[PDB]
């Protein structure tokens, strides 16, 4: 149907149809008489999968022959979403499959909805890993994603009586056609035991063994015939495990629990033993795999060349145990001396920091490591001692610096600071947006920056334009392609060419038309799938992201209530109609986040059923927000809410997705918002609120929320409404926790940004009254969104950290 979706050649369509029928018969063991839509989905998935394998085998063969430097991206999270449409896009198969399925009497879009999300992440950090894999393959890098194959990913969120309920994400129930089990490459991982000292150094003995079984998933580059690998480890008990008889067999579960479930915490550290086991499990199996591949190379025993052939990227501190594990292997097993091993380790490892929030920093109790990983603790102590000797020599007499920089934190419980370990053992440390990277050097890692300034870098985050434009917004990709061609898909800077169309009446009409169609499609989706009725002529005001105090969904709530109260005060006055959509999951143990969800639904309950309001204001909580839902709501959005307190959101990536898809942004000067505004021009952004410096000034003075309550009558009214039970008639004190927090212990200064936020929202509404000028501003945003492609981000990692050159060159088909 549309150009960007590839050719539907007679030969290809015929070949796809017959292979579809073959899979339905031989693979699914069905005929057309008994097949369900799920069967049809699987026959399609298997057909598309077949096109990958040849490229997959020759890509890996190519790397064996050429022996390039290999990039190992270590992450506990890969938030992949669905794979079917993504694979078709990158293989140029979408129109052909659409045609082949149409001719078989099937709707491909219906079949696509059947695929489960691979929900192996929490949010930003996990989704960045997924975007990174796509970009690395697209840029021809010899890259491998390594992680854990969780049996249960992020929970499915149900809303019951306005409250979040969690249910198990049993994503493997019907099978996963994309993965290939590789039981032949199973590796042992050791836990517990004790350390023994001999003439030949230390020995780790009396350990429990858990097996790590790899599952490989293909990662196709964009139309370049490159197919990289994501390898995910699964925990298996050895066959002599605990070997009365029946119980010993049943106890195998204990070992296999390691890969059972993803910890559903976003930007929060929970010091549980199972989590530590997961972290070591991925690290130990991965490093063995890395070393095996290194020894079995066309190049080489000699570990001097190890950093020339291997880069390990640590996605946050979660795989920080890679550092002492690499030391363990090199010193204890390969018998390298400490200094040489350390040189190799530092030159191999690099660390990416994702947040400055203290509650997210990993600080493991020493007693946990002592029991679980006794040899790693000894190595960490030794790293610490040698590192602090370096600090002492550079800053003689500075005893407080020594305590501040120590990997070992003293106190009630002794802890290991994993961030400090990462900096010490990596040749590069990066933040994820310019402002965040500067905050690292100025505040939390100031001491480390003074010692080793060369180590500190910025790599501003990005998103893949394949998933986040072509796949989810084909209509927009197409109108862009009509004007400037298709090259921008793997070279997003070319979107600048769109600036010369900002006064083009045809283009203005097309941009606005694509948005309306997206909005109609999403409005229909809501009725069909959730039985909720919305006005597609209203401004789609959306905030979608994990529920957090720092992300300030509560500030959004305050604005919504302000609009409601203003309408109630002057009912017959004209207001720009809005659909306010808020979505995201709360971590199960995060009480305040669960209260905020309840608040949003409670506001909806009052606002959506007030006859005086009509269809002028609607508040909807978007249930079970996840990658596949993001692909639907983001193209439909007019307004993107990025309203975190300045200095708290390291980068954000949702912001970039909205910019690419034709939404205007209301936000603070936080994270990547700063660079986005810089790229588009501040005139083309709705920036409000305190800057980082203003927050610091308020902290020194002391934040007093009562002041704002006293001086802003509209804010006072909202607090009285919350307190008195206006939004909870049956349970008048339901929201006392929220009011108390806002009035007395608000770390994120919600009240302090209220006035400017409400005023800025009025400026948004005014612009929306003028469709042509709204759309012209939109064009100015889309046109300057190129910097935020993960292809740019990965090219920067490649050149400035990994020491490898990106390549757009095709491999032969």
**Is there binding between residue 166 and a second copy (CB under 8 A)?**
yes
Helix axes 84-91, 37-66, angle to 10 degrees: 50
Number of Cα atoms under 13 Å in the Cβ half of residue 2: 18
Please identify, using beta-carbon distances, which residue of 155 and 774 lies nearer to a second copy.
Answer: 155
Which position among 49, 82, 546, 780 bears the catalytic label? Answer: 546
The answer to whether 300 is a known ligand-binding residue is yes
The answer to whether 174 is a known ligand-binding residue is no
**Is there binding between residue 729 and ligand AZZ (CB under 6 A)?**
no
Please identify, using beta-carbon distances, which residue of 559 and 598 lies nearer to ligand AZZ.
Answer: 598
The answer to whether 31 is a known ligand-binding residue is yes
Indicate the Cα dihedral angle 41, 46, 52, 57, nearest 10°.
150
**No. of helices (H) and no. of strands (E), the chain:** 33, 25
Which residues is 70 bridged to in the sheet?
Answer: 310
Which residues is 147 bridged to in the sheet?
Answer: 232
**Is there binding between residue 359 and ligand AZZ (CB under 6 A)?**
yes
Q: Report how far residue 322's alpha carbon sits from residue 302's, in angstroms, rounded to the nearest whole number.
A: 20
Please identify, using beta-carbon distances, which residue of 249 and 524 lies nearer to ligand AZZ.
Answer: 249
Q: Which of 156, 286, 384, 543 binds a second copy (CB under 8 A)?
A: 156
Which residues is 120 bridged to in the sheet?
Answer: 78
The answer to whether 297 is a known ligand-binding residue is yes
Number of Cα atoms under 13 Å in the Cβ half of residue 771: 11
Residue 31 C-beta: closest distance to a second copy, Å: 6
Q: Which of 167, 196, 707, 773 binds a second copy (CB under 8 A)?
A: 167
The answer to whether 293 is a known ligand-binding residue is yes
- Assess contact for 154 and 121: CB atoms under 8 A: yes
Residue 67 C-beta: closest distance to a second copy, Å: 16
**Is there binding between residue 215 and ligand AZZ (CB under 6 A)?**
no
- Assess contact for 476 and 637: CB atoms under 8 A: no
Instruction: Give me the phi and psi of 492, to 5 degrees please.
Output: -65, -15
Cα angle for residues 304, 75, 300 (degrees, 5° grid): 25
**207 is written with which tokens?**
């350990």
Give the dihedral sign, CA 549/552/553/557: positive
Q: How far is CA 275 from CA 123, 264, 280, 366, in A?
A: 18, 11, 9, 15
Lay out the site mask for ligand AZZ across 585-624 (x = CB under 6 A, - = otherwise).
--x-xx----------------------------------
| Binding partner selected for residue 472 from a second copy, ligand AZZ, none, CB under the kind-specific 5 to 8 Å limit | none
| Binding partner selected for residue 476 from ligand AZZ, a second copy, none, CB under the kind-specific 5 to 8 Å limit | none
| Binding partner selected for residue 335 from a second copy, ligand AZZ, none, CB under the kind-specific 5 to 8 Å limit | none
Cα angle for residues 299, 329, 149 (degrees, 5° grid): 90
- Assess contact for 231 and 144: CB atoms under 8 A: yes
| Binding partner selected for residue 38 from ligand AZZ, a second copy, none, CB under the kind-specific 5 to 8 Å limit | a second copy
**570 is written with which tokens?**
């002057």
**Is there binding between residue 550 and ligand AZZ (CB under 6 A)?**
no
Cβ neighbours around 396 below 10 Å, total: 7
The answer to whether 295 is a known ligand-binding residue is yes
Q: Which of 7, 9, 32, 174 binds a second copy (CB under 8 A)?
A: 174
Which position among 551, 552, 585, 616 bears the catalytic label? Answer: 551
- Residues before each break in the chain (C–N > 2.5 Å)? 243, 300
| Binding partner selected for residue 774 from ligand AZZ, a second copy, none, CB under the kind-specific 5 to 8 Å limit | none
**Is there binding between residue 453 and a second copy (CB under 8 A)?**
no
Residue 50 C-beta: closest distance to a second copy, Å: 5
The answer to whether 294 is a known ligand-binding residue is yes
Please identify, using beta-carbon distances, which residue of 233 and 727 lies nearer to a second copy.
Answer: 233
| Binding partner selected for residue 359 from ligand AZZ, a second copy, none, CB under the kind-specific 5 to 8 Å limit | ligand AZZ
Q: Report how far residue 541's alpha carbon sits from residue 718's, in angstroms, rounded to the nearest whole number.
A: 20
| Binding partner selected for residue 268 from ligand AZZ, a second copy, none, CB under the kind-specific 5 to 8 Å limit | ligand AZZ
Fill in the DSSP letter of residue 468.
Answer: I
- Assess contact for 260 and 150: CB atoms under 8 A: yes
Residue 351 C-beta: closest distance to ligand AZZ, Å: 22
Q: Report how far residue 749's alpha carbon sits from residue 734's, in angstroms, rounded to the nearest whole number.
A: 22
Give the residue among 327, 234, 317 at the shortest CA–CA distance from 276: 317
The answer to whether 414 is a known ligand-binding residue is no
Which position among 59, 653, 668, 793 bears the catalytic label? Answer: 653
> Which helix H or strand E contains 508, and what residues bound it?
helix 505-530
**Is there binding between residue 241 and a second copy (CB under 8 A)?**
yes
Q: Which of 161, 244, 411, 812 binds a second copy (CB under 8 A)?
A: 244
Q: Report how far residue 71's alpha carbon sits from residue 798's, in angstroms, rounded to the nearest whole number.
A: 9
**300 is written with which tokens?**
């080489």
| Binding partner selected for residue 205 from ligand AZZ, a second copy, none, CB under the kind-specific 5 to 8 Å limit | none
Is 559 annotated in the active site?
no
In sequence order, which residues have a C-beta less than 8 Å from that of residue 396 and are 6 or more positions away? none
| Binding partner selected for residue 7 from a second copy, ligand AZZ, none, CB under the kind-specific 5 to 8 Å limit | none
Number of Cα atoms under 13 Å in the Cβ half of residue 186: 13
Is 546 annotated in the active site?
yes
Please identify, using beta-carbon distances, which residue of 256 and 438 lies nearer to a second copy.
Answer: 256
Candidate ranges 68-76, 116-124, 171-179, 573-581; the one touching a second copy (CB under 8 A):
171-179
Q: Report how far residue 154's alpha carbon sits from residue 461's, in angstroms, rounded to the nearest whole number.
A: 23
Is 367 annotated in the active site?
no
Residue 263 C-beta: closest distance to a second copy, Å: 7
| Binding partner selected for residue 566 from a second copy, ligand AZZ, none, CB under the kind-specific 5 to 8 Å limit | none
In sequence order, which residues have a C-beta less than 8 Å from that of residue 758 and are 6 or more positions away? 559, 562, 714
Q: Which of 245, 396, 730, 809 binds a second copy (CB under 8 A)?
A: 245
Site for a second copy, residues 181 to 220, rule: CB under 8 A: 181, 183-184, 216
| Binding partner selected for residue 590 from ligand AZZ, a second copy, none, CB under the kind-specific 5 to 8 Å limit | ligand AZZ
Q: Report how far residue 145's alpha carbon sits from residue 116's, in angstroms, rounded to the nearest whole number.
A: 20
Residue 639 C-beta: closest distance to a second copy, Å: 33
Residue 169 C-beta: closest distance to a second copy, Å: 8
- Assess contact for 282 and 146: CB atoms under 8 A: yes
Cβ neighbours around 281 below 10 Å, total: 22
Q: What is the three-state SS of 294-334?
A: HHCCCCCCCHHHHHHHEEEEEECCCCCCHHHHHHHHHHHHC
Fill in the DSSP letter of residue 495.
Answer: G
Is 594 annotated in the active site?
no
**205 is written with which tokens?**
């003995």
The answer to whether 765 is a known ligand-binding residue is no
**Is there binding between residue 274 and a second copy (CB under 8 A)?**
yes
Lay out the site mask for ligand AZZ across 258-287 (x = CB under 6 A, - = otherwise).
-------x--x-------------------
Which position among 49, 127, 657, 776 bears the catalytic label? Answer: 657
Q: Which residues are annotated as a binding site for AMP?
A: 31, 64, 292-300
> Would you tell me which residues interact with ligand AZZ (CB under 6 A)?
265, 268, 359, 587, 589-590
> Would you tell me which residues interact with a second copy (CB under 8 A)?
25-26, 29-31, 36, 38, 50, 53-54, 56-57, 61, 152, 155-156, 165-168, 170, 173-175, 180-181, 183-184, 216, 236-237, 239-241, 243-246, 249-250, 252-253, 257, 260-261, 263-264, 272, 274, 588-589
Q: Which residues are annotated as a binding site?
A: 31, 64, 292-300
- Active-site residue list: 354, 545-546, 551, 653, 657
């Amino acid at each position: 149907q549309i150009s960007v979706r590839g050719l539907a050649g007679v030969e290809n369509v015929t070949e796809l149809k017959k292979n579809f029928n073959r899979h339905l018969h031989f693979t699914l063991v069905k005929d057309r008489n008994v097949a369900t839509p799920r069967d049809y989905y699987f026959a399609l998935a298997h057909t598309v999968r077949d096109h990958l394998v040849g490229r997959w085998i020759r890509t890996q063969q190519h790397y064996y022959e050429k022996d390039p430097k290999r990039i190992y991206y270590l992450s506990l999270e890969f938030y992949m979403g669905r794979t079917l449409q993504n694979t078709m896009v990158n293989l140029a198969l979408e129109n052909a499959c659409d045609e082949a399925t149409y001719q078989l009497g099937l709707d491909m879009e219906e079949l696509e909805e059947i695929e489960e999300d691979a929900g192996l992440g929490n949010g930003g950090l996990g989704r960045l890993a997924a975007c990174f894999l796509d970009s690395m393959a697209t840029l021809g890098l010899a890259a491998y994603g390594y992680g854990i194959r969780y049996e249960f990913g992020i929970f499915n969120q149900k809303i019951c009586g306005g409250w979040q309920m969690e249910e198990a994400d049993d994503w493997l129930r019907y099978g996963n056609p994309w993965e290939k089990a590789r039981p032949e490459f199973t590796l042992p991982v050791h836990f517990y035991g004790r350390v023994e000292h001999t003439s030949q150094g230390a020995k780790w003995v009396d350990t429990q063994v858990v097996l790590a079984m790899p599952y490989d998933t293909p990662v196709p580059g964009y139309r370049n015939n490159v197919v990289n690998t994501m390898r995910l480890w699964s925990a298996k008990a050895p066959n002599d495990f605990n070997l009365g008889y029946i119980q010993a067999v049943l106890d195998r579960n204990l070992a296999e629990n390691i890969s059972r479930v993803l910890y559903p915490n976003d930007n929060f550290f929970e010091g549980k033993e199972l989590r530590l086991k997961q972290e070591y499990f991925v690290v130990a199996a991965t490093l063995q795999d890395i070393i095996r591949r290194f020894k079995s190379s066309k190049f080489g025993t000699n570990f001097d060349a190890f950093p020339d052939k291997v880069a390990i990227q640590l996605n946050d501190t979660h795989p920080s145990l890679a550092i002492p594990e690499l030391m363990r292997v090199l010193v204890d097993l390969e018998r390298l001396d400490w200094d040489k091993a350390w040189e190799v380790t530092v030159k191999t490892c690099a660390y990416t920091n994702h947040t400055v929030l203290p509650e997210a920093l990993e600080r493991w109790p020493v007693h946990l490591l002592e029991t679980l990983l006794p040899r790693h603790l000894q190595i960490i102590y030794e790293i610490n001692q040698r590192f602090l000797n370096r600090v002492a020599a550079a800053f003689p007499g500075d005893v407080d610096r020594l305590r501040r920089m120590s990997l070992v934190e003293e106190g009630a419980v002794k802890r290991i600071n994993m961030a400090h370990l990462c900096i010490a053992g990596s040749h590069a440390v990066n933040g994820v947006a310019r402002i965040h990277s500067e905050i690292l050097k100025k505040t939390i890692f100031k001491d480390f920056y003074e010692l080793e300034p060369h180590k500190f870098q910025n790599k501003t985050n990005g998103i893949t334009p394949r998933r986040w434009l072509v796949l989810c917004n084909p209509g927009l990709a197409e109108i862009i392609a009509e004007r400037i061609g298709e090259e921008y898909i793997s070279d997003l800077d070319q979107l600048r060419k769109l600036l010369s169309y900002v006064d083009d009446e045809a283009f203005i009409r097309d941009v606005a038309k694509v948005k309306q169609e997206n909005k109609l499609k999403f409005a229909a989706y809501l009725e069909r799938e959730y039985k909720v009725h919305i006005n597609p002529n209203s401004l789609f005001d959306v905030q979608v992201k994990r529920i957090h105090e720092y992300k300030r969904q509560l500030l959004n709530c305050l604005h919504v209530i302000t609009l409601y109260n203003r309408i109630k005060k002057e009912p017959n006055k004209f207001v720009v109609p809005r659909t306010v959509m808020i979505g995201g999951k709360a971590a199960p143990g995060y009480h305040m986040a669960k209260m905020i969800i309840k608040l949003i639904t409670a506001i909806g309950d009052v606002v959506n059923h007030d006859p005086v309001v009509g269809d002028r204001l609607r508040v909807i909580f978007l249930e079970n927000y996840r990658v596949s839902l993001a692909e639907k709501v983001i193209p439909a959005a007019d307004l993107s809410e990025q309203i975190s307190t300045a200095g708290t959101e390291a980068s954000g990536t949702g912001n970039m997705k909205f910019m690419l898809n034709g939404a205007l942004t209301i936000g603070t000067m936080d994270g990547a918002n700063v660079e986005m505004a810089e790229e588009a021009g501040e005139e083309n952004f709705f920036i409000f609120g305190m800057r980082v410096e203003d927050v610091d000034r308020l902290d020194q003075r002391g934040y007093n929320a009562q002041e704002y309550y006293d001086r802003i009558p509209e804010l006072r009214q909202i607090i009285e409404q919350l307190s008195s039970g206006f939004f909870s008639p049956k349970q008048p004190d339901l929201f006392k926790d929220i009011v108390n927090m806002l009035m007395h212990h608000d770390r994120f200064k919600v009240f302090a940004d209220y006035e400017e936020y409400v005023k800025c929202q009025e400026r948004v509404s005014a612009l929306y009254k003028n469709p042509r000028e709204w759309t012209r501003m939109v064009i100015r945003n889309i046109a300057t969104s190129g910097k935020f492609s993960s292809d740019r981000t990965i090219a920067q990692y490649a050149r400035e950290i990994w020491g490898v050159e990106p390549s757009r060159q095709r491999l032969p088909a």
